[PDB]
Ligand binder design. Structure first.
Ligand SMILES: Nc1ncnc2c1ncn2[C@@H]1O[C@H](COP(=O)(O)OP(=O)(O)O)[C@@H](O)[C@H]1O
Lengths: 450, 400, 50, 223
């Protein structure tokens, strides 16, 4: 309450709303804490740290805005609540529960407000279409990200992307994380969901250059130390923003995780730079500080400035598969993954996403069939399927059904105790590409025969 | 009409080629049936009798694999089809080991080299295969080197004229002829999800249904050549016989274009024309006489179905015998030799022509030869045990 | 006494697998029943218990 | 009147295309080419509908679309991996008269890249293989021209050779590399270089194989 009273002083219009806002804040925090515990998932921990982050985020959103109605205040409060509490949730019913409970508490502690404007389904906030952190409609955001994606295939690396709603929100989450000092990000997702791809895209958006190590056998700890020294030198001395990205493959080695944990926590690692390495570090650090506009001579303050530069310039992005048991060992070996890095969870590709990828990628196809007749009853697996669907919609819905069929078969085999291979969206992309090649070859053969 | 159905069968074949790689025969068939039920439920035009082993590959490739020591089985043919049209380099799971030799024989003309992840020189070998273009088959995927992640992901940078893969620290080039083949000898193993995503699995492990079908096919070939011949004919009714018709049409086109007014001068083109007419008539006759042939071959297959079930049961008995003693390690090839010895080179069948009597003799002699070969490699105390298992299997098989 | 050198046993199994013997070649391994025998060697051989 | 008008409007686009076709291949920038062709496509799309109905406009639009789709063949052709030998092979395959200083975008845009894609990707994959092999040769050349023996003082008597393991490992890996390159389908072009280099490497291996034994025995006998 006293924090929120300090915060609201920027906007004199809302001063009497401090108590309802802080009361709803505390209430929702308590419900989230009691509902989600460590028993269900290893990362379901809730603390005053999250709610201080909440206050900080609302303050950051409110700082440049000159004045905003109460519905805007509730919108910002709900957006921060979603980004802090819904983001870490793993399974869909939990996300629905936290979403609905946010609406419930906001309406309970804030009567006499318009529900529709204060809170809607696509509560999105960004600073790409405007100077400040004003909410943006998802369609204009979609056009902007599609243009930047065009530029992104043009420059850096060409990765074809389709843009559905989930990736749209995930880009926003990553961008929000990147524009924060010591903004380490952690991603839980099945392989092929694009975690590295969207991370690279957003890093290019914010100007962060991408660095990834190449882990192999005989990649000893000394190689990791050397790569860490290189990235530390680039981030701190040269004031070059680095988007460090490590998968699970390089995390497997235990020796790396101690150094990573120390770097995540304190922004620096002791013993990485020693002897002549320390001398070279100080030599380049003095030049970098002079370039910045500071005059430091003694080694301790130079190292402190280097640490501050690394804090403000390094953004480690971790990616791992959704293995909750494995998440337990990751928590055991390194608390920084769960104390400092903000965790995001998008392992599941929704049916809507499956539909969108299928429709986009099977566009050069020719499934158009004027004489195709709509069946009276169809196995609709994509609820938002337009009806009466064309042939194309039927084929892509069929493909989505194939993906859910493999998911169900793997679940059934796991129930029986048999060995089960993960079914990833990479499998779906492979299926679509094979469909393209096979359909093209067979149509060509039929046409040549004709 | 074939154009009206191309979307459906292309969908089924692609979904089968991407998925259904790790699963066994039963799960593959169940998934295909569920898929087909969905599209027919969705009013999607698909042919009701897709022969996946025939739609994705034609006769010459099958003959080439058979000359490449590929065992002639439905699952083996489907796997080999997967080994041909692969977007991601496949992972072979073959406890028996015929798939590996099949790969080397297939790509021997391409100078295929064998390598194992356990070998320390493997990385160097990989570089060579990447830098020159010769295909490489890497074995023992249990110790999978994460340095293979780039090659598997196909991220290549074209800087200057340089098409490079950052294989670890190095930045070596890629040759267009390169292709990797991951292999496994242990059927029971768990892979990280990233590996599973970046590879398509091809399972060569033999299950109860798979071996039962293989033994049934071998019986149909050995004892009933007419039934096996007709079943093969319906296997070639779609695609193959039509291809023969098309090449006959091409020959007719060439022959008629060749004549300079000799269409009437010799009056001999009519012989070729009536030959093509007879071939088309026999193709059409086999095309109309299908359902009868399925019901007949299905009756014949059901006739020997208890035999195939007994074969699968006894073979899995031999496999599970490893628990009794460590000396009881028996291969699928050993059981195959037992099966050849009971089927061919059997003195008891000589002079017997009754199909039912020959079948009964074959069931008796199968158990007899199996016990004769196994007990010689067993301690004396365990002979009673194996006799007990064989008796129980016969009880399960026998009717009444 | 082939059981005395298991590594020798696995390397002989590798040599035997990639080879085309003459139509009358026969390799016999007299061995003491011992777990040290390789599993693959047992799998590729006609076992005889004495 | 309408035909004269549509000819006048297409005159600017035709003159632009002629300007593009006059650019010598050495000076063409395929990315600038793609941007400018996209600009031309937009300008043509800005034409009035009454002119869009004529066959000339559709023909020019199809030519522009074909130019766009063969622009990726242009991308791959501009690559430095293409050598003179590959250019003469392409010369034979397309039965043309391109002169090395005379190559221009016009000559290749006149030749139907929409008809002979099979030939060109064949020759370009061949070029990729040959270039990979010759760059392997360049790496071998530089590593064996830069390599120096590590000499370290021994009891103020001599400067003995160190790093026997590293040198032997390097020569072994290089020997295996040339042996494997012998099996490459592109090995024929760089055959003589491979012969010379493998002779050098085998002589190297024999020399230091004798040298390590001589050094060890000398050191022991000195002791
Ligand atoms: N939204 C998307 N649209 C299209 N393709 C995608 C999308 N997300 C991922 N991909 C595909 O995934 C591949 C990269 O996956 P990657 O990001 O490495 O998986 P992970 O997230 O496990 O690191 C790319 O080739 C890309 O085609």
């Amino acid at each position: 309450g006293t924090f929120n009273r300090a915060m609201l002083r920027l906007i004199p219009s809302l001063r009497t709303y401090a108590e309802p806002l802080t009361a709803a804040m505390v209430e929702f925090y308590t419900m989230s804490q009691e509902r989600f515990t460590q028993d269900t998932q290893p990362h379901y921990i809730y603390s005053p740290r999250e709610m201080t982050r909440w206050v900080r985020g609302i303050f950051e959103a409110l700082r440049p805005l000159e004045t905003l109605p109460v519905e805007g205040l509730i919108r910002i409060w709900a957006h921060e609540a979603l980004r802090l509490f819904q983001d870490r949730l793993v399974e869909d019913e939990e996300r629905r529960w936290t979403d609905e409970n946010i609406d419930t508490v906001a309406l309970k502690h804030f009567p006499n407000i318009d529900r529709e404007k204060a809170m809607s389904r696509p509560i999105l906030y960004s600073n790409w279409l405007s100077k400040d952190y004003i909410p943006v409609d998802q369609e204009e955001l979609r056009d902007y990200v599609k243009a930047r994606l065009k530029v992104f295939y043009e420059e850096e690396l060409d990765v074809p992307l389709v843009l559905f709603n989930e990736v749209l929100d995930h880009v926003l989450r990553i961008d929000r994380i990147f524009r924060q000092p010591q903004g380490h990000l952690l991603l839980i997702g099945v392989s092929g969901a694009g975690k590295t791809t969207l991370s690279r895209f957003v890093a290019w958006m914010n100007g962060l250059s991408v660095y990834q190590i190449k882990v192999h056998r005989k990649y000893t700890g000394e190689d990791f130390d050397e790569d860490l020294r290189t990235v530390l030198r680039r981030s701190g001395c040269k004031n070059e923003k680095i988007a460090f990205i490590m998968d699970e493959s390089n995390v497997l080695d235990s020796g790396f995780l101690e150094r990573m944990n120390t770097l995540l926590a304190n922004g620096e690692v002791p013993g990485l730079f020693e002897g002549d390495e320390y001398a070279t570090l100080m030599t380049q650090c003095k030049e970098g500080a002079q370039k910045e506009g500071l005059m430091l001579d003694s080694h301790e303050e130079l190292y402190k400035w280097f640490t501050s530069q690394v804090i403000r310039n390094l953004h480690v992005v971790f990616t791992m598969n959704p293995s909750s048991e494995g998440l337990k060992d990751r928590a055991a070996t390194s608390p920084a993954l769960f104390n400092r890095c903000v965790l995001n969870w998008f392992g599941d590709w929704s049916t809507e996403a499956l539909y969108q990828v299928g429709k986009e990628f099977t566009s050069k196809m020719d499934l158009e069939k004027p004489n195709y007749i709509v069946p009276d009853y169809m196995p609709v697996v994509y609820d938002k399927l337009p009806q009466p669907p064309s042939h194309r919609e039927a084929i892509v819905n069929s493909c989505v059904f194939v993906h859910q069929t493999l998911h169900q078969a793997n679940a059934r085999l796991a129930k029986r105790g048999g060995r089960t291979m993960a079914i990833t969206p990479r499998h779906y992309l492979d299926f679509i590409n094979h469909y393209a090649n096979l359909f093209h070859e067979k149509r060509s053969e039929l046409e040549e025969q004709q | 009409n074939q154009m009206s159905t191309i979307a459906g069968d292309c969908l089924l074949s692609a979904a089968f080629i991407a998925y259904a790689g790790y699963f066994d025969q039963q799960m593959r068939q169940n998934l295909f049936t569920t898929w087909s039920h969905h599209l027919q439920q969705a009013n999607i035009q698909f042919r009701t009798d897709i022969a996946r082993t025939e739609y994705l590959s034609n006769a010459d490739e099958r003959l080439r694999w058979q000359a490449s020591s590929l065992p002639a089985d439905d699952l083996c043919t489907e796997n080999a089809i997967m080994l041909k049209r692969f977007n991601r380099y496949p992972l072979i799971i073959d406890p028996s080991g015929q798939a590996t030799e099949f790969i080397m024989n297939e790509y021997k003309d391409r100078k295929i080299t064998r390598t194992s992840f356990l070998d320390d020189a493997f990385r160097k070998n990989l570089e060579s295969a990447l830098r020159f273009g010769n295909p490489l088959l890497v074995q023992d995927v249990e110790s999978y080197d994460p340095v293979l992640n780039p090659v598997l992901n196909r991220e290549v940078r074209r800087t200057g004229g340089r098409v490079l893969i950052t294989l670890g620290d190095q930045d070596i080039d890629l040759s267009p002829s390169f292709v990797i083949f991951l292999s496994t000898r242990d059927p029971t193993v768990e892979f990280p999800p990233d590996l599973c995503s970046r590879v398509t699995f091809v399972n060569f492990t033999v299950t109860r249904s798979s071996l039962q079908s293989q033994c049934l096919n071998e019986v149909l070939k050995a004892e009933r050549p007419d039934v096996d011949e007709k079943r093969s004919d319906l296997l070639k009714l779609q695609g193959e016989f039509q291809l023969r018709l098309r090449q006959l049409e091409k020959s007719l086109l060439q022959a008629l274009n060749e004549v300079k007014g000799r269409i009437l001068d010799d009056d001999t083109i009519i012989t070729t024309l009536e030959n093509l007419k007879r071939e088309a008539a026999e193709v059409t006759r086999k095309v109309e006489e299908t359902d009868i042939v399925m019901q007949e071959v299905e009756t014949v297959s059901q006739q020997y179905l208890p035999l195939s079930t007994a074969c699968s049961s006894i073979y899995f008995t031999m496999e599970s015998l490893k628990q009794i003693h460590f000396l009881y390690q028996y291969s699928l090839q050993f059981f195959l030799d037992i099966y050849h010895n009971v089927l061919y080179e059997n003195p008891n069948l000589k002079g017997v022509t009754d199909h039912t009597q020959r079948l009964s003799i074959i069931t008796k002699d199968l158990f007899q030869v199996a016990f004769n070969r196994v007990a010689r490699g067993m301690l004396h105390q365990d002979h009673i045990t194996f006799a007990m298992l064989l008796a129980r299997i016969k009880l399960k098989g026998t009717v009444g | 006494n082939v059981h005395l050198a298991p590594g020798w046993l696995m390397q002989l199994e590798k040599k035997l697998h990639s080879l085309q013997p003459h139509a009358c070649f026969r390799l016999f391994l007299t061995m003491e029943i011992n777990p040290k025998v390789p599993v693959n060697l047992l799998r590729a051989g006609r076992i005889f218990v004495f | 009147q309408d035909l004269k008008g549509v000819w006048s409007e297409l005159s600017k686009v035709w003159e632009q295309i002629d300007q593009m076709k006059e650019q010598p291949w050495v000076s063409v920038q395929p990315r600038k080419l793609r941007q400018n062709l996209d600009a031309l496509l937009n300008q043509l799309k800005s034409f009035p509908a009454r002119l869009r109905q004529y066959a000339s406009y559709e023909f020019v639009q199809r030519l522009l679309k074909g130019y766009m789709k063969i622009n990726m063949l242009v991308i791959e052709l501009k690559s430095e991996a293409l050598k003179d030998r590959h250019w003469k092979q392409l010369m034979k395959r397309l039965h043309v008269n391109w002169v090395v200083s005379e190559l221009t975008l016009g000559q290749i845009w006149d030749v139907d890249l929409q008809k002979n894609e099979a030939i060109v990707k064949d020759v370009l994959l061949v070029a990729q293989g040959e270039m990979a092999l010759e760059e392997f040769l360049k790496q071998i050349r530089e590593v064996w021209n830069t390599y120096e023996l590590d000499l370290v003082n021994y009891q103020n008597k001599c400067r003995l050779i160190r790093g026997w393991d590293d040198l032997f490992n390097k020569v072994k890996e290089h020997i295996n590399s040339v042996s494997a390159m012998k099996l490459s389908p592109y090995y024929k072009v760089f055959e003589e270089d491979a012969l010379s280099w493998e002779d050098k490497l085998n002589r190297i291996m024999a020399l230091f194989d004798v040298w390590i034994d001589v050094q060890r025995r000398w050191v022991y006998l000195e002791g």
